[PDB]
Structure 1
Amino acid sequence: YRYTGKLRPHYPLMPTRPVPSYIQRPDYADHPLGMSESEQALKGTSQIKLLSSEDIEGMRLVCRLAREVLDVAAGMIKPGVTTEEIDHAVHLACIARNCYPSPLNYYNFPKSCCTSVNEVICHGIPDRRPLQEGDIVNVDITLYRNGYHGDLNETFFVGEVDDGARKLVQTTYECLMQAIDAVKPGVRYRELGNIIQKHAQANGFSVVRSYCGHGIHKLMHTAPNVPHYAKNKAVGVMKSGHVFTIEPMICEGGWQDETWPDGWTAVTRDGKRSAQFEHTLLVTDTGCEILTRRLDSARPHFMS
């Protein structure tokens, strides 16, 4: 394999971490290939669940706990900390909240969160590499509680970064928030990509095509598929009671991705940096409830 940038995986990985049996487990947790029969049973359907009030309570709780876990990870970000160390802390924080770390064994993903450094677009695997001053790192958290998943991520600075990193991460965050600000009943899912690409392109960045936002609730990934690029063909119309994520990946160079031999790590083909932010959103009768928002602080960690 020809690496696209300066990053390399740092093996070996620690043996998979167990989750105590008292924590409730999603269907894929015990499938040998980590397949989710409940997701597969709805493959290729574009119908979107309308959440009940019990379903809304469950999503509110799990998304609030997921934010708490992201915040734990944010508190660990500094030069010298390895991504596996971050993942270990995340793992324990999930368990402390009686939640299962959704990514763990999801189609055999080996860790409890994703850590994506510099040219890693998404799904980086936590490993023995210490964070370097100047790096940018996304931690993506997903938790499962009482049958509901909640999903969010943020990109962080490691010590001091360069202006390019500041601009990339800021614009990325703005893309997410401009899309969120448009969410309300009656908006076509396909419109979000128009808004995202327009701001990314105005700042000289591209928009990753291969990965989309997604419905989320009882299933981790389900309808709707939410592309983040312009003139996409996403199916469907927002309605009060819909829950889904938006998670734009924006890159300094070109939009093309490829995947490491590990089967997960997605990297820019040119080796230039990518940034991402994600929230889980509930469409209300008039707008959007950001289920994964911070409750106690005005801004994302990188602006704090």
Structure 2
Amino acid sequence: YRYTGKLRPHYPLMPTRPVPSYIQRPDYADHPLGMSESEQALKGTSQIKLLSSEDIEGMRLVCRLAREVLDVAAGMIKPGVTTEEIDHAVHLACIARNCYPSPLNYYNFPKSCCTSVNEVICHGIPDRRPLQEGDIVNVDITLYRNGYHGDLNETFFVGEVDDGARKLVQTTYECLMQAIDAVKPGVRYRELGNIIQKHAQANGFSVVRSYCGHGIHKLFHTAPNVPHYAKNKAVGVMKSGHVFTIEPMICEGGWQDETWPDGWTAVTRDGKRSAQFEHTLLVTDTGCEILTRRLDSARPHFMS
């Protein structure tokens, strides 16, 4: 394999971390290939769940806890801390909240969160690499509680970063927020990509095509598929009661991605940097509720 940039995996990985038996597990947790029965039963369907009040309560809870766990990771971002160390803290913080870390054994994903440094677009596997000053790093968190998943991510600066890094991270966040602002009943899912690409393209950045936002509730990933690029063929119309993510990945160079031999790590083909932000959203009559919002600060960590 020819690596596309400077990053390399840093092995070996510590043995899989156990989740105490008292924590409720998703179906895939014990499947040998980490396949999800309930997700496969819906493969290729485009119908979107309309959540009940019980569902919405369960989603509000798990999204709040997920935000708590992401803030835990945020507090650890400094030079010299390894992504494995972040994952360990994350793992323990999920368990302390009586939550299962959704990524763990999801299709055999080996860790409890995804850590995506620099040219890694998404699905970076926490490993022995210490973070370096100048790095940007996304941590993507998903928790499972009482049958519901809650999903968010932010990109962080490691010490002082260059102007390009600041512009990429700031722009990606703006893309996400401009998309969220358009969310309300009656809006087509395919419209969000028009908004995101319009802002990224205006700032000289490109929009990853191979990975999209997704429905999430009793399933980790489900309908609707939510592309982040312009003129896409996403199926469906927003309705009060829908829950889904918007999670744009934006790149310094071209949009093209490829996957490391580990089967997971998605990297830019040109080795240039990529950044990402994600919220889980509930569509309401007036617009939408940001279920994974920070509660005690107005801003994402990179600007606090």
Taking structure 2 as the reference length, what is the TM-score of the superposition?
1.00
Deviation digits for residues 203-228 of structure 1, max 9, x if unmatched? 00000000000000000000000000
Distance 1:238 1:151 in 2: 19
Shift in Å at residue 2 of structure 1?
A: 0.2
Match of 1:168, SS state, is helix
In structure 1, the partner of 2:156 is 156
Root-mean-square deviation over aligned CA pairs:
0.2
How far apart, CA to CA, are the structure 1 residues paired with 2:273 and 2:24?
A: 37
* Partners of 1:127 and 1:31 in 2: CA distance: 24
SS of equivalent to 1:295: coil
Aligned to 1:125: 125
Displacement of 1:285 in angstroms is 1.1
* Deviation string, structure 1 residues 5-37 (Cα, Å, up to 9, x no partner): 000000000000000000000000000000001
Deviation at 1:202, TM superposition (A): 0.1
Instruction: Tell me how far 1:289 sits from its aligned partner.
Output: 0.1
Distance 1:279 1:178 in 2: 12
Question: How far apart are 1:178 and its partner, in Å?
Answer: 0.1
- 1:286 deviates by 1.7
Q: Supply the distance in 2 between the matched residues of 1:135 and 1:228 (Cα, whole angstroms).
A: 24
Matched position secondary structure for 1:171 = helix
What whole-Å deviation, never above 9, does each CA across 1:258-279 have from its counterpart, x for those lacking one?
0000000000000000000000
Task: Give SS of 1:140's match.
Answer: strand
- What is the alpha-carbon distance in structure 2 between the residues aligned to residue 57 and residue 285 of structure 1? 17
Q: Hey, what's the Cα distance between the residues in 2 that align with 1:263 and 1:285?
A: 41
Q: 2-side partners of 1:81 and 1:52: how far apart?
A: 42
Aligned partner of residue 137 in structure 1, secondary structure: strand
Paired residue for 1:171? Answer: 171
1-side partners of 2:45 and 2:238: how far apart? Answer: 16
Partners of 1:142 and 1:49 lie apart in 2 by 19
Cα distance in 1 for residues equivalent to 2:172 and 2:32: 36
Q: In structure 1, how many angstroms separate the alpha carbons of the residues matched to 2:285 and 2:263?
A: 40
User: Matched residue of 1:89: which SS?
Assistant: helix
Distance of 2:12 and 2:93 partners within structure 1: 23
CA deviation string 1:115-168 (max 9, x = no partner) = 000000000000000000000000000000000000000000000000000000
| Cα deviations by residue, 1:174-225 (Å, 9 ceiling, x for unpaired) | 0000000000000000000000000000000000000000000000000000
Question: Take 1:52 and 1:264, find their aligned partners in 2: how far apart are those partners?
Answer: 34
Distance 1:303 1:47 in 2: 38
TM score, norm. by length of structure 1: 1.00
**1:204-253 C-alpha deviation (Å, 9 max, x unpaired):** 00000000000000000000000000000000000000000000000000
Aligned to 2:291: 291
Q: State how far apart, in whole Å, the 2-side matches of 1:79 and 1:286 are.
A: 43
**Alignment partners' CA distance in 1, 2:121 and 2:297:** 27
SS at 1:298's partner residue?
coil
Name stretches of at least 5 consecutive residues in structure 1 with no aligned partner: none
Write the distance in 2 (CA, Å) between the matches of 1:76 and 1:194: 35
Kindly report which structure 2 residues correspond to 1:1-304, keeping only aligned pairs within 5 A, or say none. Answer: 1-304=1-304
Could you tell me which runs of 5 or more consecutive residues in structure 2 were left unpaired when the two chains were aligned.
none
Measure, in 2, the Cα distance between the counterparts of 1:144 and 1:77: 24
**C-alpha distance in structure 2 between counterparts of 1:170 and 1:5, whole Å:** 22
Runs (4+) of structure 1 exceeding 6 A deviation are none
SS at 2:28's partner residue? helix
Q: Distance in 2 between matches of 1:191 and 1:8?
A: 36
Secondary structure of the structure 2 residue equivalent to 1:179: helix
